[PDB]
């Protein structure tokens, strides 16, 4: 039920943060040159 | 060399976009079960 939704939401949040870190790393490299 | 760092970083970002879309799909899927 809700606990499955919560865990799914938690995974999405984790992926959003990982994507944002990936996005920042690419921006840094594009600035380092 | 410089292009390679860019490409590698771009590939990681693509992977993370795909993983996020798959997380987004799983959420919707459970919400569709209810």
Curated annotation (Swiss-Prot), chain A:
| Compartments, record wording | Cell projection, Ruffle membrane; Cytoplasm, Cytoskeleton; Cell surface; Cell junction, Focal adhesion
Q: Which domain of life is it from?
A: Eukaryota
The UniProt function text for this chain reads: High molecular weight cytoskeletal protein concentrated at regions of cell-matrix and cell-cell contacts. Involved in connections of major cytoskeletal structures to the plasma membrane. With KANK1 co-organize the assembly of cortical microtubule stabilizing complexes (CMSCs) positioned to control microtubule-actin crosstalk at focal adhesions (FAs) rims.
What does the record say about domains?
A: Consists of an N-terminal FERM domain linked via a short unstructured region to a large flexible C-terminal rod which contains 13 amphipathic helical bundles (R1-R13). The rod begins with a five-helix bundle (R1) followed by three four-helix bundles (R2-R4). These are followed by a series of eight five-helix bundles (R5-R7 and R9-R13) in which the N- and C-termini are positioned at opposite ends of the bundle, creating a linear chain. The four-helix bundle R8 does not disrupt the chain because it is inserted into a loop in the R7 five-helix bundle.
Quote the subunit structure annotation.
Part of a complex composed of THSD1, PTK2/FAK1, TLN1 and VCL. Interacts with THSD1; this promotes interaction with PTK2/FAK1 and VCL. Interacts with NRAP and LAYN. Interacts with SYNM. Interacts with ITGB1; the interaction is prevented by competitive binding of ITGB1BP1. Binds with high affinity to VCL and with low affinity to integrins. Interacts with APBB1IP; this inhibits VCL binding. Interacts with PTK2/FAK1. Interacts with PIP5K1C. Interacts with F-actin. Interacts with SVEP1.
Query: What's the protein name?
Result: Talin-1
| Species this chain originates from | Mus musculus (Mouse)
């Amino acid at each position: 039920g809700i606990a499955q939704i919560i865990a799914a939401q938690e995974e999405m949040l984790r992926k959003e943060r990982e994507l944002e870190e990936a996005r920042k790393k690419l921006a840094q490299i594009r600035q380092q040159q």
